Amino acid sequence: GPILEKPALKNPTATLRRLLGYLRPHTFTLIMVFVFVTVSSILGVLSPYLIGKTIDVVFVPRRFDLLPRYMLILGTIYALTSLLFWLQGKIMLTLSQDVVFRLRKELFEKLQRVPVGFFDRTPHGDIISRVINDVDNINNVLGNSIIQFFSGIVTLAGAVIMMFRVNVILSLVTLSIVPLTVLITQIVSSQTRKYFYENQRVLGQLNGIIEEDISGLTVIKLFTREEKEMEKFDRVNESLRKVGTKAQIFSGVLPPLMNMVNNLGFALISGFGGWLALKDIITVGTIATFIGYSRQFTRPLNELSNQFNMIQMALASAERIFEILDLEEEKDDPDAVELREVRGEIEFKNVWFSYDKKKPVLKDITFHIKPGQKVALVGPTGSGKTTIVNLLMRFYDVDRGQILVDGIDIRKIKRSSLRSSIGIVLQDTILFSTTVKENLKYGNPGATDEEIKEAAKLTHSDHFIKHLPEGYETVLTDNGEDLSQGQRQLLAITRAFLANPKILILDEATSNVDTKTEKSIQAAMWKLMEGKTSIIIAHRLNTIKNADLIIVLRDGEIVEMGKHDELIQKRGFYYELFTSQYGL
């Protein structure tokens, strides 16, 4: 659709240079195409010349004995023209696709190595559409738009040169339609762009009204808002009818207008040509040849003008892709060492962290965990008990203070061993659209399914898993949509168990679980933590009682600590939270 504004360029040549680097291994092949496009465009301007020449040599002097010779040359000129199009096309097809394949490979590798922060800042839908469109823009311009733009140049120049070498005046007559084409196109273009966007504005509003009203129909009916909603729809719709008609008009008048310019050219060539034939200044075949050029200066000009705009639009997208490829990557340290087989000591020392560096999230957090101890970090929303998990998994890094596991600072540890020695079951973990057996295997690749079923029983999963349509072979499309949430929390528990880390973080939800599975998920929690250090964002009564340590959080500050019974008596904050929720 009609472009809004021309893209800003942070030196297009540097990005051009870089983008041309992807074309270096296929240079020999790329030269070959340019000469194909070159010769196939020249042979394309020769055709209407021979048609005039045949008329002048074979038809007019009645010298028909020369006909099979002229038709043989044409028949091969044509054959080669289409032979070259097929080559030029199929060569660039698997050439440009081989490029964006690389770009797709590289961008995805960037995904698995970029800091997790970028996925937390910008919406996932945005960063895929913006990226996949940019990749497509390159693909479009590389495989089609460039060679079509080049062909347009050779063809256009080829026709003008040969036109002038036949007759100068008739060339000036034909080229008279160029300023008409440019004047007309420019005017219609601006109008089309204007009302395109004016219509896009009103339509997006109208569509907005539709999407939300259908999604919130139940509310609209509860508030008996049908009429008011209908009235809101009407006034926009009635105004879309009016603008859409205008957008539709100006987006549709360039073809009859271009056609007219073609017919105006045909007329001039026929009149001025025929009137130059009646003075022996030109031949009749000459007139035929110029007619063969009468449409060469309308739409092919516009194609050039718009293929040029796709080029710009492409380079801008190239400039975006390269920057994503230039982002910093999570690398380890040369002094970062592998984890010794310890039992799991965790420690925070006056740690400060936030996300936007303006509003603090954790302020002066300091605590110590002993190997084996189940620890429950409790608190209301706005505490930071969830922010703990990220810092401890090094998805983020602390600003002030330091976190350390088993005596060595977490930032001086290889991420590989750290994330192997530490498990994690987030509040709403993510499953994959594969099989149950494959999902539970995700933690330990080299683990036989005979061993999995043995471990699947030790978390209360083996029952409902075999009661599935295809048992363990069952494919759970859309990340377990056909499974109840309670069953998926189980699968997450079974999965984390198979990885077998010596440190555990747990955020088991309690909200929408059925009481049956509820007793089996907590039984699974006991077998889960059996043998390792555990940190639990608790929402259950029977876990904050068995807690070897409770650490109470509030407003980013660690306020209270100590065991359950002890914290009830202080009457400070834990007692509040407890009696204002368990004081039934």
Binding site: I51, I55, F59, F64, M71, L74, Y78, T81, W86, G89, K90, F101, K105, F108, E109, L111, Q112, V116, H124, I127, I128, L206, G208, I214, S215, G216, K221, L222, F223, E226, M230, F233, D234, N237, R241, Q248, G252, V253, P256, M260, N263, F266, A267, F272, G274, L278, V284, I291, P380, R419, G423, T429, I430, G443, P445, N512, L541, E576, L577, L584
Partner: protein, 572 residues
């Protein structure tokens, strides 16, 4: 069955526009078909006979015909635009008018996502189809048929070469379509796979990272990357061979015209101008035949929109007010269920069954049960959003099927599980229950809903902007916003479907305690899957697996109601 609704009625009131567009287009076509004959006249009857007037006057005449055909084409576009646009406006309105009347069960059939695409995309598709029918659907087949007429008009014999040129082209189009269709569809399958792998890697990045499985994901992206590459080469190699072969056939058209026509001028049966006119008519016929092929490709996709749009237009609303429905100037808040059974789809077992219970006006009752016990459905029966399959539902001892919907719903306020807000201002959203509501009354409700302080700390406060769906507010403040919105209505029945999901446990009690002093004289239902919340109400209704298990207080239920014990066991 199905329905007799028809989309050809949205065009009827613009029939004048719908007939001028094709007529104006034929003028363009006649003017476009005239040029090669006038050229042949210039050479055969002008140059050949040496008279300037002939060449001059027909030369001028070709200009006049060009502009005339220009008026033709613009006039078609203009008129087709009106007809096209008014059609889509009229279509869209009724589509929206229908959807507004739909019930839970209606929406349950055309899923909400498909419903939106049916009113947005399909409406534009159909708009385009009508635009198309009134311009190029007239143009192309007229050039094709008129071009053949002209060639026949110039020389019957030479026209036989059209019998040789047309079948291979049609055969080419048939082959390309039948072979390219499943190969293009294969691209969509390979594209979605690329999209899925990227999404799941974004979605569960912390999972793939922590499990040290990044390299396994690169491996799985290569499979989707290669499949997409493969399916795109194999498909577009067809197109990349189709276009040059089409042009070749057309160019051998020229060859045949000059060769077969060459032996016709030699026999003094066809002048030299007629050959020039014939070559142009030849290209006209061929390119038009190509445009017709593309039209055919779009129609088959367009009609899928016609069917989808028609299904909505043919859908009867499941909930209807009776002709002589009772008016309810007031409601006490008595609410009863007698042997209520409910099912969403008739392939499953009931989601409610043998539901028998009553509630005196003014009472605060906690409806409590595990996940999927039927609580939300049970509540949905009260404002006639759904109907019992068996049994009935009463409000003030009246079957709700008997009372006016605007009346019944005007006295019931619900607070749905999933919270939805609407574009505009906070004050606009909150006044959804009362447009005569004053600011004091609104602040009142928001205070009880524990949201007035959040609102008051906004730069524009109550005039702050609500973005589509309430996306700019968190789940916590949205919930509270709708609670306030519920209370401004001043209901005689108040339903709170699990609406403590996104607030602090402490803030929760603050909300519910204030209801007592503001819902003074209001039958209240408080729906929850957790016992502490249910204990706030005077009496607890316990649902388990679609049936009512018990109805009393904590002591009674702890002794006699076994499903209540299971809940207690799972929580304490």
């Amino acid at each position: 069955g199905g329905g007799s609704k028809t989309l050809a009625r949205y065009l009827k009131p613009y029939w004048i526009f719908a007939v001028l567009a094709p007529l104006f287009m034929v003028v363009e076509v006649i003017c476009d078909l005239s040029q090669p004959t006038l050229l042949a006249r210039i050479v055969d009857e002008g140059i050949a006979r040496g008279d300037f007037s002939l060449v001059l006057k027909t030369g001028i005449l070709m200009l006049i015909v060009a502009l005339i055909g220009a008026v033709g084409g613009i006039g078609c576009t203009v008129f087709a635009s009106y007809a096209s646009q008014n059609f889509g406006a009229d279509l869209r309105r009724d589509l929206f008018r229908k959807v507004l009347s739909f019930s839970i069960s209606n929406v349950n059939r055309f899923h909400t996502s498909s419903l939106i695409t049916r009113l947005t995309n399909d409406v534009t598709q159909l708009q385009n189809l009508v635009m198309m029918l009134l311009r190029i659907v007239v143009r192309a087949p007229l050039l094709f048929v008129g071009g053949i007429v002209m060639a026949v008009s110039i020389n019957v014999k030479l026209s036989s070469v059209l019998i040789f040129l047309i079948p291979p082209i049609v055969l080419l189009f048939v082959w390309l379509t039948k072979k390219g269709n499943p190969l293009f569809r294969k691209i969509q399958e390979s594209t979605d796979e690329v999209n899925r792998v990227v999404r799941e890697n974004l979605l569960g990045v912390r999972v793939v990272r922590a499990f040290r499985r990044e390299e396994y994901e690169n491996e799985n992206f290569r499979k989707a990357n290669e499949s997409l590459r493969r399916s795109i080469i194999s498909a577009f190699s067809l197109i990349v061979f189709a276009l040059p072969l089409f042009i070749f056939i057309v160019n051998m058209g020229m060859i045949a015209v000059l060769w077969f026509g060459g032996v016709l001028v030699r026999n003094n049966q066809m002048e030299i101008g007629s050959i020039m006119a014939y070559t142009n008519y030849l290209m006209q016929i061929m390119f038009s035949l190509m445009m017709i092929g593309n039209i055919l490709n779009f129609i088959v996709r367009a009609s899928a929109s016609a069917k989808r749009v028609l299904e909505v237009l043919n859908e009867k609303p499941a909930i209807e007010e009776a002709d002589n429905a009772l008016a309810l100037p007031n409601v006490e808040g008595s609410v009863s269920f007698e042997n209520v059974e409910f099912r969403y789809f008739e392939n499953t077992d009931p989601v409610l069954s043998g539901v028998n219970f009553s509630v005196k006006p003014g009472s605060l009752v906690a409806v409590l049960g595990e996940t999927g016990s039927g609580k939300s459905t049970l509540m949905n029966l009260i404002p006639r959003l759904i109907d019992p399959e068996r049994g009935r539902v009463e409000v003030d001892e009246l079957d709700v099927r008997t009372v006016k919907l605007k009346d019944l719903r005007g006295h019931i306020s619900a607070v749905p599980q999933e919270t939805v807000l609407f574009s505009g201002t906070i004050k606009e959203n909150l006044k959804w229950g009362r447009e005569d509501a004053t600011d004091d009354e609104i602040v009142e409700a928001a205070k009880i809903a524990q949201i007035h302080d959040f609102i008051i700390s906004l730069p524009e406060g109550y005039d702050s902007r609500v973005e589509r769906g309430g996306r700019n507010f968190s789940g916590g403040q949205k919930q509270r916003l709708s609670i306030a919105r519920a209370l401004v209505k001043k209901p005689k029945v108040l339903i709170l479907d699990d609406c403590t999901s996104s607030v602090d446990p402490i803030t929760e009690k603050r909300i519910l305690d204030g209801l007592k002093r503001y819902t003074k004289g209001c039958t209240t239902f408080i729906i929850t899957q957790k016992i502490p919340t249910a204990l706030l109400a005077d009496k607890i209704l316990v649902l388990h697996e679609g049936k009512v298990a018990g109805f009393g207080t904590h002591k009674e239920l702890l002794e006699h109601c076994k499903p209540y014990r299971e809940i207690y066991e799972s929580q304490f």
